[PDB]
Amino acid sequence: SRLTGKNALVTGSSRGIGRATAVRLAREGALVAVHYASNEAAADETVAQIEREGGRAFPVRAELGVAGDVHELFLGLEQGLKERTGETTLDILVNNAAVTGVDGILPEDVTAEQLDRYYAVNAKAPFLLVQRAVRNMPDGGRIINISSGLTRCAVPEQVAYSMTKGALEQITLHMAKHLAPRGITVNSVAPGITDNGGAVFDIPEIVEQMAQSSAFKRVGEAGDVADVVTFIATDESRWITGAFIDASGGTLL
Amino acid sequence: SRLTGKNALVTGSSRGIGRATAVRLAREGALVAVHYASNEAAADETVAQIEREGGRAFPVRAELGVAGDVHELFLGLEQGLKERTGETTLDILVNNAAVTDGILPEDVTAEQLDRYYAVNAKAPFLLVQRAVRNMPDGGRIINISSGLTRCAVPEQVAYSMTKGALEQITLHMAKHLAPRGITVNSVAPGITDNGGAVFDIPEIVEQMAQSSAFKRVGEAGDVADVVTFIATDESRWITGAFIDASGGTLLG
Ligand SMILES: NC(=O)C1=CN([C@@H]2O[C@H](COP(=O)(O)OP(=O)(O)OC[C@H]3O[C@@H](n4cnc5c(N)ncnc54)[C@H](OP(=O)(O)O)[C@@H]3O)[C@@H](O)[C@H]2O)C=CC1
Ligand SMILES: NC(=O)C1=CN([C@@H]2O[C@H](COP(=O)(O)OP(=O)(O)OC[C@H]3O[C@@H](n4cnc5c(N)ncnc54)[C@H](OP(=O)(O)O)[C@@H]3O)[C@@H](O)[C@H]2O)C=CC1
C-alpha cells in the first residue's frame, strides 16, 4: 500500500496498458481517475475491477485532441476528486492515452490529417495536460509519459506515430528539469509490443512473429508494463527523473 | 517481503551504496552475502544491522582484481549459503564494489588503468560468468555504473572507461541470458553520500549538490531503492537497460 492517500489520473485507462496501470495504482491505495474517450463500458469495467479488488476509482470522459479537451477532463477529475476526498490534489499523472494502431501507415500513404490527429492526441494533449496538472500537484508528485520503443527502433509503417512519441519524450526531458525544484519527477516508460486485448493478439501466428521482437521471445502483457509504471509512481523512484525507462522485454538490444 | 526465499550477493556491501542495498534486499526477505575487501568491521556492521532488522546475512571477504578473486569469493559465498539453506542457489548478483577527485588525463598511468579495469570491469564480467552457474531462471544481475558514462569530466576518464566497459556487460549479457529469464541492467548513480569524509564538509557538499537537478547530493538509499526494485519480480520486463538513478544529473 505504497500510494495510500494519493490521487492518480491514468489517461486512456478503459483498456490495455492504461487499465492494467489503473488497476495496479489502485491496489497500492491510490484513488484513480479512469479516463477514456468513448468506450464507456470498458471504462466502467476498469472501475468495476478496482472496486471489487477493494480500491477506489471513477470514470472521466474526455476526447483528447479537440478544443476544450483538457478543460473537460479536469472538470470531471476535480468533481470526482472533491466528492471523494474534499480536495482536488493530483499526485500522479500518467499520460497513457494515444492514437495507437496495429495497422500502421506506410510513409507514402500518410495524410496531413493523420499527422495532425497523432500530434494532437499523442504530443500536444500530454503537454497541455502536464501544464494543467501541475497546478494541482504537490511537491513530490509524479508525471509518467508512456512512450514506445519505436523511438529507438526503425519501423517505417509507424513513422507518423513515432514522430509523436519523439515529441512526447522531449516533454520528459525538458519538464523534468523545469519541475525538479518542486520535487516532481517526470519520466518516460517505453513499452514494446504489448497485448492490449486487440484482435491481433487472438491470431497465434501473428503473435509468434511479434514475439520475436523481444529478447524473451514473448509479447508483453499489459501488466509487465504497468508494473514498471507503478514503481515509478512510488516514493522509491524519487531519484529517477528525466529518464527513458525501457519496459520492452529486451526489444531495444 | 518481495524477496522471501532468495539469496543475494552484493559486492562491496560493507559500506556506502552497497551497504544500503544489502540492507534493503534483506528487508525484503533475501539472505544477503555482504562482500568486502578488507574492512571486516564495516561488513560485520552491515550484517548486524540486517540481523537487528529481522533479516539474514553473512560476510564474505575477497579482494577483487587479483588472481583467485572469484574463487575466493565463491568459496565463502557457497559455504555460507549451504550452511544456511542447504543449497548454493544465487538469485541476485549486484556488481557494486569498485575503485571510485579523479586523475587528470596527463597523470593517468598504465598501472592505474590496469587497477581500475581489474576491479571495475574485468571482475564484474568474471563474477557474472561464475554466478550464472548457481542462478535459477528468473534471476537478476545488476551492474552499478555511473552517470559519468554520459557526462564529460576529464579527471574521470580512467574511471569512466571502466564503467563504459561495465555497461557493455549489461547490453550483451542481457541478450545472452534472456532465454533463462535472467535480467541484466545497469543502475547509474550520480554523486552519492557514501559516508566518506568529504560528505562531512558542508561547503564541498553544497558544490557537489549543484550537479543534481534537485540540488542535493544523493543518499545511498536513493540509489539502493532503485537497485532493490530491479531485484524484484516486477522489473521482469526491464533488461539490457540503463537506469538513471542520478537525481537528474544528466539534465545539466
Ligand atoms: N504494443 C502496445 O500495446 C504498445 C503501446 N504503447 C503505448 O502504450 C499506451 C497504451 O497503449 P495500449 O494499451 O495499446 O492502447 P489501447 O489502444 O489499447 O487503448 C487506448 C486508450 O487510449 C484512449 N484514447 C485513444 N484515443 C483517445 C483520444 N483521442 N482521447 C482520449 N482517449 C483516447 C482509449 O479510450 P477508449 O477506450 O475510449 O477508446 C483507451 O483508453 C499508448 O501510449 C501507446 O502508444 C507503446 C508501445 C507499444
Ligand atoms: N558518488 C558515488 O558514491 C558514486 C558511486 N558510484 C558507484 O557506486 C558503487 C558503490 O560506490 P560507493 O558506495 O561510493 O563505494 P565505497 O567506496 O563507499 O565502497 C566501496 C565498497 O567496495 C569494496 N571494494 C572496493 N574495492 C574493492 C576491491 N578491490 N575488491 C573488493 N571489494 C572492493 C569496499 O570494500 P571495503 O569496505 O573492504 O574497502 C566497499 O564495500 C561503485 O560501483 C561506484 O563506482 C557511481 C557514481 C557515483
| A140 CB within 8 Å of a chain B CB | no
Residue A90 lies in a domain: yes
Residue B177 lies in a domain: yes
According to DSSP, the residues that pair with B60 across neighbouring strands are: B35
Interatomic CA distance for residues B241 and A147, integer angstroms: 15
Pairing state between β B7-10 and A194-195:
unpaired
Task: Map residue A147 onto helix, strand or coil.
Answer: coil
Residue A227 lies in a domain: yes
- Residue of A9, A13, A15, A224 with the most ligand 1 atoms within 8 Å of its CB, for mutation: A15
Dihedral angle of Cα B12, B15, B21, B22, to the nearest 10 degrees: 80
Residues B246/B188, Cβ–Cβ less than 8 Å: yes
For the beta carbon of residue A223, count every other beta carbon within 10 angstroms: 20
Residue A94 lies in a domain: yes
Grid coordinates in use for B110?
598504465
Task: Map residue A139 onto helix, strand or coil.
Answer: coil
Read off the DSSP letter of residue A242. Answer: S
For the beta carbon of residue B5, count every other beta carbon within 10 angstroms: 11
> Which residue shows C-alpha cell 519505436?
A150
For every residue of chain B, which 3-state class applies, written as one string?
CCCCCCEEEECCCCCHHHHHHHHHHHHCCCEEEEEECCCHHHHHHHHHHHHHCCCEEEEEECCCCCCCHHHHHHHHHHHHHHHHHCCCCCCEEEECCCCCCCCCHHHCCHHHHHHHHHHHHHHHHHHHHHHHHHCCCCCEEEEECCHHHCCCCHHHHHHHHHHHHHHHHHHHHHHHHHHHCCEEEEEEECCEECCCHHHHCHHHHHHHHCCCCCCCCEEHHHHHHHHHHHHCHHHCCCCCCEEEECCCHHHC
Q: What is the CATH number of the domain that holds B198?
A: 3.40.50.720
Residues B148/B163, Cβ–Cβ less than 8 Å: yes
Task: Map residue A233 onto helix, strand or coil.
Answer: helix
How far is residue B235 from each of residues A61, B67, B84, B141, B203, measured CA to CA in Å?
Answer: 32, 35, 27, 12, 38
| Residue A150: domain span | 7-247
What is the widest separation between alpha-carbon atoms in chain B? 52
Contacts of A242 in chain B (CB under 8 A): 213, 244, 248, 250-251
Interatomic CA distance for residues A72 and A26, integer angstroms: 23
B201-B206-B209 Cα angle (round to 5): 120
Residues B81/B7, Cβ–Cβ less than 8 Å: yes
Helix (H) or strand (E) holding A21: helix A16-27
Catalytic, B36? Answer no
Interatomic CA distance for residues B186 and B189, integer angstroms: 10
**Obtained via which technique?**
X-ray
Count how many domains chain A has.
1
Residue A206 CB partners (closer than 8 Å, separation 6+) = A200
Cα-flanking dihedrals φ and ψ of residue B185, to 5°? -140, 155
Each residue of B201-232: b (16+ CB within 10 Å) or e?
A: eeeeeeebbebbbbebbbbbbbbbbbbbbbbb
Residue B135 lies in a domain: yes
Question: First vs last Cα of chain A: how many Å apart?
Answer: 34
Task: Map residue A60 onto helix, strand or coil.
Answer: strand
Q: Is the CB of A65 under 6 A from ligand 1?
A: yes
Residue B110 lies in a domain: yes
For every residue of A179-232, which 3-state class applies, written as one string?
HHHHCCEEEEEEECCEECCCHHHHCHHHHHHHHCCCCCCCCEEHHHHHHHHHHH
| B48 CB within 8 Å of a chain A CB | no
Residue A2 lies in a domain: no
User: Is A227 within 8 Å of B213 when comparing Cβ atoms?
Assistant: no
User: Is A231 within 8 Å of B236 when comparing Cβ atoms?
Assistant: no
Dihedral angle of Cα B75, B80, B86, B89, to the nearest 10 degrees: -70
User: Is B237 within 8 Å of A220 when comparing Cβ atoms?
Assistant: yes
Residue B122 lies in a domain: yes
Interatomic CA distance for residues B54 and B29, integer angstroms: 9
Interatomic CA distance for residues A62 and A54, integer angstroms: 26
- Within 13 Å and on the Cβ side, how many CA atoms surround B60? 29
Interface test with chain B among A239, A244, A246, A248, by most B beta carbons within 10 Å = A239
Grid coordinates in use for A220?
508483453
Dihedral angle of Cα A201, A204, A209, A214, to the nearest 10 degrees: 60
Q: DSSP readout, A103-124?
A: T---GGG--HHHHHHHHIIIII
- The C-alpha of A23 sits at a distance from chain B's nearest C-alpha, in angstroms, of 15
| B225 CB within 8 Å of a chain A CB | yes
Q: How many CB pairs under 8 A join A and B?
A: 98
Cα-flanking dihedrals φ and ψ of residue A104, to 5°? 60, -175
Interatomic CA distance for residues B127 and B135, integer angstroms: 12
Contacts of B236 in chain A (CB under 8 A): 224, 227
Grid coordinates in use for A54?
477493494
Q: Is the CB of B124 under 6 A from ligand 2?
A: no
Interatomic CA distance for residues B27 and B20, integer angstroms: 11
Q: Is the CB of A36 under 6 A from ligand 1?
A: yes
Q: Is the CB of B217 under 6 A from ligand 2?
A: no
